[PDB]
Structure formats: structure tokens, C-alpha cells
Design a protein around this nucleic acid. Structure first.
Lengths: 150, 81, 142, 129, 142
RNA sequence: UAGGGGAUCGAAGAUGAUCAGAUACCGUCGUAGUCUUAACCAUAAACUAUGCCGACUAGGGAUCGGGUGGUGUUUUUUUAAUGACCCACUCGGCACCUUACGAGAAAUCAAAGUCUUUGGGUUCUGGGGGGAGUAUGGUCGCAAGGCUGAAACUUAAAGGA
């Protein structure tokens, strides 16, 4: 029930049971590999890849069609990105919020929400400590985000 | 009810009940092989777009994304699968 | 999931959250400061020696009237100044001023008995010879 | 969360059965539970029970009798020594006769009277009557 | 370090001889040993130049009685360290345990290069300082 | 506490009323405050005056949120589609009725039930009435004040239904 409010939401996907094939789809596994790796340099994020893959071509999930899970694949190919993608939207949100707090120090709602958010991050950053996918020590630093992306 | 086979109930009672409880979960959304009229091409679109996809290349448009299901244009056979 | 930690490693937080609680329960209050030695007359006791002053008269508390018989004492210790109470008859008579008397409780702890107010002790002996006798005439006094 | 499994389903089974449901559905399936029922069943307290899989942690139907009186989960899962169960029975079994306290050793996700014939003891999850 | 004299006082493993008169080949000695108690006596011991008497293997300290571990906590001492042993304890009343810990002062040789975190086996010497008793014997890195 | 805001209400203050008095009730105005930024305080009948985890007992009919099934109700557009709807079912609520097998001093209580047939897990609290949540120390606060918390003395009742 979402970890920050009074809210008990339910809504995901009801991956379907079949492990193998769609059958109705008859194109190749190699085929979508190529496609993702096509996409990536252009300017991707794995989250989006699937969406784009789903809405246009055969696919159903990368997952059936290959024995991997997008990322894995980009990582083999070296396109993983320096960041674990979900993070690179949170930090972003930081900058994008803090900035707004500073045009209008007379705003609380916003304030709180910022924190809240500093925290999403520390916890998620503690995990992508733990498991060898952030060089140890990483710590998040409020002010260092604006030449980390632009 | 003092009792009931909940294994297999009616087909009814599933169609209406919520995706995530028919027992074994399964999706509602499903895919839909589109001839824009001009070309014969056939693009494999999804019932819930999010994207409008273009058809194959003709640059055409197709199906807008809304709350859940595309609204597809006029031309489109949209045979399901 | 009532208000207490329950799983396995929840020794630590229990031997504390009774040891806190106990506090308030009045008794375990007396026994840690324990009061008994500092406060009150007998300190960590049961009986004691004292020597009388006046023969005071204390009327009643009221559903009662009852003008009872009390004596101030001088103990032979903290010195408190105490009153105390006499049984039987007049009983008063047999406690002739600046005499030696042997005091004890009133079976109530602290507290304060029946129809008497700030009063908390009885006169058991005198001179050390009963009262019980110096009212059923098994002895007499020097 | 759901912080613990066995519990959750058990409680619903003493809240089906009370009302006279002839059965149950319960969510998160374990081994633990499969084993748990397989004890209960041997002893005459439910029947059949028709796993169902869905590639997930999975759902389990448990057809009734209307016998069950009562099967609470205990629940830290304490430890226990042989000669100690002799304290439990009479602090949560109506009689003695009967009605099995129930525990987890090494064999065994198996009650105490069978435990004698094995002479073993460890931790004590649920109990039936 | 590494440079061996460094401790004005010169260094040697006592009772060792070499023979500047007599053909010298190999020039140096060494004396080493093999703890024992199922151990492996590493090769940075019969190789390593360093001295240290308090060395298990290159010196005069026995190992007898505990064998034990755990988790390093701090290392900041010129040839010596510290261990935790996070353990469990069974209060008979709440029937439950607590996470308890004692720290441990111990010698150590240059044969091992321990950072913090590492799992670590140790021995138990005669006494070796003010506190100090065990001597590392086997590291368990990443 | 210092800036901004200062419509309306409106302690304080002023008033006219009533009244033996009326510093109150009634009426009309009224700083301060109500509002906000930034910082304090941490109390309340903060109230279900009912600690939470759990597990089990006995019936109902409502409702909010989900989910499942019924060639289910309309929508009509051509059949569907969904959607509202009906009903069937369930899991999770927020409550309610009815019993009393139980419990209670009772009033009442599906929990205040499973307690002299006395024991599932654990944290706080009280032990007559006042004196008094004062005096004191110790501490948090700028202050208002909070949390901590005596005793001497007095008293045969104070209280609940």
C-alpha cells in the first residue's frame, strides 16, 4: 500500500501462466536481441524498451522469446548504463524538485515531499550498496547532480 | 453458500471478476494483424497502446493511447491476433 | 498482534519494558529508595523504645463524637514527635509521664486506623511489664 | 507484510471452519503447509485437498469434514527438549488421551505421540482438535 | 616497515647462526614452525623477512585451549587487532535470546593482511600484553 | 519570536442594558488573535474514557474497496465491446442488528467471550480518601510551561452501578 501515503493500490501484470512461445507469433529469437541493442544506443531505458517492443513488433516481455531479462542482455553488450535505471529518474526528480523549492522558501507541501523523496533515495541506494552494483561508498550528495546529467 | 466447486466454477463467473482472481490469474488485454488501407501491412499492435504506432514505415497514423484501450483510424481491419 | 514484541530475539526488549512498567506498582515504589530506611519512625523495623512526654486528647473523624486517649513520644533513636494510641478501659493511668513505653504498629502499614485521623501507633508495654497485665491484673508497676 | 505465512492461512481455516463452510481457498501455498496438512489428514481431520500452481508462491483448496474444532499456529517457534512437551500438552490440549500438539525436528513435520516412537525433538508450529 | 631494522635495537629470532667464515650460500636463516591443531603454516612465513617474536609461526609463542572466531572490528594498531563475536543468550524466564557482544584484543603477524570485515579463526596464548591473549591463525576474503 | 495579512469574528478593554449588587448573562463597537511564511512549545474528555499481535467460538442483513462466475440488466448500433446495473460468490475494511451457550457489581460486551476447570506472545500503569501533580531538587523552553515527583499532617469513608 505505497510506502509513503494512506493508499492501498493494486495494479500490475497478469504475466500469463505460458512460459514458452506465443505460437501465434512465429518470428525469431535472435530477431529481437539486434532490435534492443538497434534501440539502446539511440537513447534508451530498459523500462521503455519493452513498452516500445510491446505496442510495435511481435512481442510478448523479452521474456519467452529469449532466455534473459533485457537489462543481463545490455550488460554481454555493455550498454548496462552506469546507473540502475529506476534510480536515474528519482535522482533527477531531486534536482527537478529542489530547484522549484528555490524560486518559493514559502512552500511546505513542497518542502517534506523533497525529504519523502532525499530517503526514496537512500534506501534504494542502500540495496544498489549491498549487491556489488554500486562501487562501495557511492553516499548521495544533494548538490552534485547537474553535470551528472547536463 | 454451504459449499461449492471452487475447482472450475462457471466460465460466467470469471469474465466479470477481477484480472488478478479467476484462482489462476490471466490477462484481459490481447493482440491486432492492421491493413492502413493503402498498404497490406501487417503490424502487430497491442490493445492497450501507451504510443501511436507507425504502420511498417506509409507514415500511418493508427491508434491513439487512452486510459486503457486504443482508439484505433476509421481504416483498419483489426482482425484480432 | 497485541502491544508487545512477541518473536524470538525480543529477549532484550522484555527484561526492560517489565522493569520499567514495574515502577508505579506501588510496592516494588517502598522497596527501592527503601523509603522503610530513611522515612517513617521505625525505619527498617518492628518495635520500639520510647519515653513519654503530655497525655493528649484527640476527638473522633465523623460518622461518629469520641474523645480517644493518645500519648506523645522520644524514640530511643531518631528522637521524632509521633503520636500513639492506648487500649481497654482507663489504661491511661498506668502511663504516668516520662515513663518507659514499648511501641509497635497498628497491622495497617504506614497507614492510618478506623476513626482516628494523623495517627499510626499502639502502646503494647510500660516500664516492659505488658498493659494487657497492668489491665487484667497479673502484675503491677514499680 | 505477510509477515508470517503459515499463520495468515491457518486462521482462515479457524474462520471458514466455525461458520460451517464445507471449504477452504487459501493463498500463499510452501513446503511447510503441503507438509502440515499431510499430518492433519492421516489423523480422520480433513479431506483430499486439489495444490494449484500458477509458477507462483501459488494457491490451496482444502475440502472439508465438519469435525475441525480447532488449529492455531503457536508463535515465536520456540526451543523444546524431548522431556518438556509434557508441559505443553496440559497448557493446550483439552484432554490427554487426546488431539495432537504439533512439531519440527529432522525426520519431521510430525506429532508428539509419533515422536516417542522416534525419540526426537526440536522447535512446534501448530496443534490440533 | 617491510624495513625489518626499524626498534634502534636490531632484531633476530634468537640461537640464529650465520657463517661469515664458512662456503656462504643462502646467506640467511629461517626459524619457523607449524602451529598444528589441523593447520595450514603459510607461504609468507618461511618467506617473509619480518621479525616479530609475537609471531605464532616465526617465533616463541606456543597455542593451546580457545579455538575461536569472528568479524573484524577495527584495525589501527602497529601489528595487532580487534574482533567481535556477536552471540546469543537464553533467559530462562521470557522462555528468548538477545544479540550480545564482547570485543577482543589480539596479536598480528605480517604473514596475514587483514582489512576490516573479514571472517577470522584465532588461537589462545600465554598472556601477551595488558589485555591481549589469542594471535590470529587463519583469515576469509572476498 | 520576527516579517506579511489585517474582511469577519472577537478574551481583553469601553460601553448601554437587566439587576438588591452585576465587575456575567442580553445589545453595539472593538485591539490582540483568528489567516500565512519561518521558526518555538508537546498539552486535551489526544475518547471506543477499551494497549497491540495472534488463534478459536453464533446467527444474520446492509455498505466502501477489490477479485471470480452466471447463452446475468440495460445501454442498441448490427451482434457485441465494455460501462452502469442485477444477482451469485468471496478476501479486506468502516460500522449495525439479534441472541446469550459465555462474562460481569451491574449498565451492558462478538468481544469487557475462551479466568478459581485459574497460564498463547510481551510494553506501560493503580493499590483507601485527601494534603497535591503542590514543595522540593534534576531537567527540556525565550517565556508561558511541560516531564520527573515527595513527606509531615490529617481522615472513616470518598466512590461505582
Amino acid at each position: 500500500g505505497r510506502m509513503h501515503s494512506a493508499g492501498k493500490g493494486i495494479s500490475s501484470s497478469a504475466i500469463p501462466y505460458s512460459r514458452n512461445a506465443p505460437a501465434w507469433f512465429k518470428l525469431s529469437s535472435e530477431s529481437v536481441i539486434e532490435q534492443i541493442v538497434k534501440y539502446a544506443r539511440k537513447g534508451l531505458t530498459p523500462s521503455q524498451i519493452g513498452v516500445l517492443l510491446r505496442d510495435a513488433h511481435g512481442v510478448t516481455q523479452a521474456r519467452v522469446i529469449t532466455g534473459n531479462k533485457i537489462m543481463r542482455i545490455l550488460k554481454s553488450n555493455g550498454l548496462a548504463p552506469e546507473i540502475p535505471e529506476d534510480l536515474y529518474y528519482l535522482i533527477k526528480k531531486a534536482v527537478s524538485v529542489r530547484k522549484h523549492l528555490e524560486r518559493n522558501r514559502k512552500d511546505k507541501d513542497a518542502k517534506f515531499r523533497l525529504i519523502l523523496i532525499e530517503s526514496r533515495i537512500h534506501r534504494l541506494a542502500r540495496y544498489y550498496r549491498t549487491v556489488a552494483v554500486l562501487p562501495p561508498n557511492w553516499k548521495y550528495e544533494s548538490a552534485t547532480a547537474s553535470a551528472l546529467v547536463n | 453458500v454451504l459449499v461449492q466447486d471452487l475447482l472450475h466454477p462457471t466460465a460466467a463467473s470469471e469474465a466479470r471478476k477481477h484480472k488478478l482472481k479467476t484462482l489462476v490469474q490471466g490477462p484481459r488485454s490481447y493482440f491486432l494483424d492492421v491493413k492502413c488501407p493503402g498498404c497490406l501491412n501487417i503490424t502487430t499492435v497491442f490493445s492497450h497502446a501507451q504510443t501511436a504506432v507507425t504502420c511498417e514505415s506509409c507514415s500511418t497514423i493508427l491508434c491513439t493511447p487512452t486510459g486503457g484501450k486504443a482508439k484505433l483510424s476509421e481504416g483498419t481491419s483489426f482482425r484480432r491476433k | 498482534g497485541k502491544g508487545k514484541p512477541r518473536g524470538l530475539n525480543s529477549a532484550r526488549k522484555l527484561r526492560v519494558h517489565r522493569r520499567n512498567n514495574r515502577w508505579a506498582e506501588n510496592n516494588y515504589k517502598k522497596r527501592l529508595l527503601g523509603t522503610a530506611f530513611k522515612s517513617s519512625p521505625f525505619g527498617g523495623s518492628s518495635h520500639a523504645k520510647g519515653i513519654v512526654l503530655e497525655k493528649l486528647g484527640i476527638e473522633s473523624k465523623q460518622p461518629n463524637s469520641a474523645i480517644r486517649k493518645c500519648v506523645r513520644v522520644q524514640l530511643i533513636k531518631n528522637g521524632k514527635k509521633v503520636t500513639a494510641f492506648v487500649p481497654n478501659a482507663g489504661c491511661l493511668n498506668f502511663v504516668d509521664e516520662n515513663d518507659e513505653v514499648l511501641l509497635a504498629g497498628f497491622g495497617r502499614k504506614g497507614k492510618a486506623k478506623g476513626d482516628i485521623p494523623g495517627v499510626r501507633f499502639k502502646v503494647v508495654k510500660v516500664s516492659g511489664v505488658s498493659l494487657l497485665a497492668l489491665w487484667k491484673e497479673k502484675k503491677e508497676k514499680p | 507484510t505477510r509477515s508470517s505465512v503459515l499463520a495468515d492461512a491457518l486462521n482462515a481455516i479457524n474462520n471458514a471452519e466455525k461458520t460451517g463452510k464445507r471449504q477452504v481457498l487459501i493463498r500463499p501455498s510452501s513446503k511447510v503447509i503441503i507438509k502440515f496438512l499431510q499430518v492433519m489428514q492421516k489423523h480422520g481431520y480433513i479431506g483430499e485437498f486439489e495444490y494449484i500452481d500458477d509458477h507462483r508462491s501459488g494457491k490451496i483448496v482444502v475440502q472439508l469434514n465438519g469435525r475441525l474444532n480447532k488449529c492455531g499456529v503457536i508463535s515465536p517457534r520456540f526451543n523444546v527438549k524431548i522431556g518438556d512437551i509434557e508441559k505443553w500438552t496440559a497448557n493446550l490440549l483439552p484432554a490427554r488421551q487426546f488431539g495432537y500438539v504439533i512439531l519440527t525436528t529432522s525426520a519431521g513435520i510430525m506429532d508428539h505421540e509419533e515422536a516417542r516412537r522416534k525419540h526426537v525433538s526440536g522447535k512446534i508450529l501448530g496443534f490440533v482438535y | 616497515e617491510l624495513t625489518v631494522q626499524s626498534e634502534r635495537a636490531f632484531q633476530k629470532q634468537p640461537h640464529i647462526f650465520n657463517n661469515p667464515k664458512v662456503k656462504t650460500s643462502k646467506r640467511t636463516k629461517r626459524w619457523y614452525k607449524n602451529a598444528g591443531l589441523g593447520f595450514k603454516t603459510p607461504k609468507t612465513a618461511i618467506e617473509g623477512s619480518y621479525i616479530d617474536k609475537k609471531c605464532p609461526f616465526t617465533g616463541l609463542v606456543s597455542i593451546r585451549g580457545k579455538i575461536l572466531t569472528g568479524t573484524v572490528v577495527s584495525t589501527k594498531m602497529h601489528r595487532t587487532i580487534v574482533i567481535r563475536r556477536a552471540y546469543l543468550h537464553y533467559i530462562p524466564k521470557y522462555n528468548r535470546y538477545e544479540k550480545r557482544h564482547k570485543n577482543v584484543p589480539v596479536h598480528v603477524s605480517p604473514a596475514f593482511r587483514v582489512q576490516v570485515g573479514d571472517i577470522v579463526t584465532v588461537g589462545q596464548c600465554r598472556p601477551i600484553s595488558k589485555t591481549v591473549r589469542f594471535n590470529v591463525v587463519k583469515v576469509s576474503a572476498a
